[PDB]
Amino acid sequence: VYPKALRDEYIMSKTLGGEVKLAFERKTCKKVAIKIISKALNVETEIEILKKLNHPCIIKIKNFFDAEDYYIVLELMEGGELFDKVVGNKRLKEATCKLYFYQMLLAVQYLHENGIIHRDLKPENVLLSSQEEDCLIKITDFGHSKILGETSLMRTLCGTPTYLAPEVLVSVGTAGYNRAVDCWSLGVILFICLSGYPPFSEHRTQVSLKDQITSGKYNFIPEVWAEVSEKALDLVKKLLVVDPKARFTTEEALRHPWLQDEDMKRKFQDLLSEENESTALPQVLA
C-alpha cells in the first residue's frame, strides 16, 4: 500500500497513466498528480534539478516521498500529454503549433540558460494545462537530464598535453554542444505537430532508421506539407541539421521569422496572467 506519510497529506485516487495517479491534497482539497518511480539514482537528481528550476513552461514539484517506491507530487496538467493530441496522424492547427512550440523553446532555453540538457524531449513529456486548444504547456520527465558544470576536459586543458591522448585533443572541437540534442528533439517534435507523421520512421521504407537520422534525410510528403507554411518548414529544416555546431539554438529558433508573431505571443502572455492572477499578491503601487 501507500506509505503512512503520503497518506497523511494526500487522498490517493484513480490512475492517470512509472505510473501517475490523481490525488487530492488534504489541506487544500486540491487536485494533484502523484508520480510513482518504483525501486533509483536519477530520481534524487530529478527532484534536485526540479526544486531549483522555476519557469511557467517547466513542471513544478510540490512534495516528495522516499519509501519502497519514490512518490513525486506534481501540479496537475488537465490537458494531459501532447502525444494524445498527435497520435494517428492527428495534425494540430499551425497557430496551435506556434503557441506550443514557442513555450517549448522558452522552457528549453531556460533549461540551457541554467546548464540543464533535458535529453529526452518527446510529445509524451510535453503536458497541456487545460483541455483547451490554446493553453500553457509544461516540460516533464527530467529523468535523463544532464548538468553542465566544470568539464574534466576543461581541467585537462590547463596542463601540458605531453602524455595526453590525440582523440581527447580532437574532442575539444565538438565539445560543449550536447544541448543541441534538445534542439534536434524540438525539431522532431515540431515536425510531428505540423505534418501529423514522424520525420524518421521505419514505416514503408527500405533505409535503416539509424541511416535516416545520420543522413538527416527526413520523410517528406509534400501533399501533407502543402497545408503547412513556408516559414514553419524552414524552421524544421534549420533545426533538423546533422552538424550540431550548425544546428539552430533555442535563441536562434526564437529569433526566426516563424516565431515573430504578435498575436501568438499576446495569447501566451494572456494565458500566463490567467494562471498567475489566482496566486497574485497585491503589489506596492508607485
- Provide the binding-site residues for a copy of itself, judged by CB under 8 A: 121-122, 144, 146, 152, 156, 160-170, 174, 180-181, 184-185, 188-189, 198, 200-201, 209-210, 213-214, 216, 242, 244
Q: From the CB of 123, what's the least distance to a copy of itself, in Å?
A: 9
Q: From the CB of 127, what's the least distance to ligand RQQ, in Å?
A: 5
- All residues at 6 or more sequence positions from 225 whose CB lies less than 8 Å from its CB, including other chains: 194, 195, 233
- Determine, following the binding rule CB under 6 A, whether residue 33 of this chain makes contact with ligand RQQ: yes
Q: Which range of residues in 13-21, 104-112, 217-225, 251-259 is near ligand RQQ by CB under 6 A? A: 13-21
200 touches which of a copy of itself, ligand RQQ, none (CB within 5 to 8 A by kind)? a copy of itself
- Determine, following the binding rule CB under 6 A, whether residue 34 of this chain makes contact with ligand RQQ: no
Quote the longest CA-to-CA distance of the chain: 67
The total of other beta-carbon atoms located within 10 Å of residue 80's CB is: 13
Decide whether 62 or 217 has the Cβ nearer to ligand RQQ.
62
Q: In this structure, what are the phi and psi dihedrals at residue 62, rounded to the nearest 5 degrees?
A: -100, -45
137/56 Cα distance (integer angstroms): 8
The total of other beta-carbon atoms located within 10 Å of residue 73's CB is: 19
62 touches which of a copy of itself, ligand RQQ, none (CB within 5 to 8 A by kind)? none
Element (H, E) at 128: strand 126-128
Decide whether 36 or 233 has the Cβ nearer to ligand RQQ.
36
66, 69, 120, 261: the catalytic one is 120
- All residues at 6 or more sequence positions from 235 whose CB lies less than 8 Å from its CB, including other chains: 190, 248, 253, 256, 258, 259
201 touches which of a copy of itself, ligand RQQ, none (CB within 5 to 8 A by kind)? a copy of itself
Please tell me whether residue 126 adopts helix, strand or coil conformation.
strand
Position with the least CB separation from ligand RQQ: 77
Decide whether 70 or 184 has the Cβ nearer to a copy of itself.
184
Residue 166: all three cell numbers together: 590525440
125/83 Cα distance (integer angstroms): 8
- Determine, following the binding rule CB under 6 A, whether residue 139 of this chain makes contact with ligand RQQ: no
154 touches which of ligand RQQ, a copy of itself, none (CB within 5 to 8 A by kind)? none
Which of 18, 16, 12 is closest to 81 using CA atoms?
Answer: 16
Can 120 be counted among the known catalytic residues? yes
Binding residues, by number, are 17-20, 35, 75-81, 124-125, 141
> Is residue 120 a contact partner of residue 286, using CB atoms and an 8 Å limit?
no
185 touches which of a copy of itself, ligand RQQ, none (CB within 5 to 8 A by kind)? a copy of itself
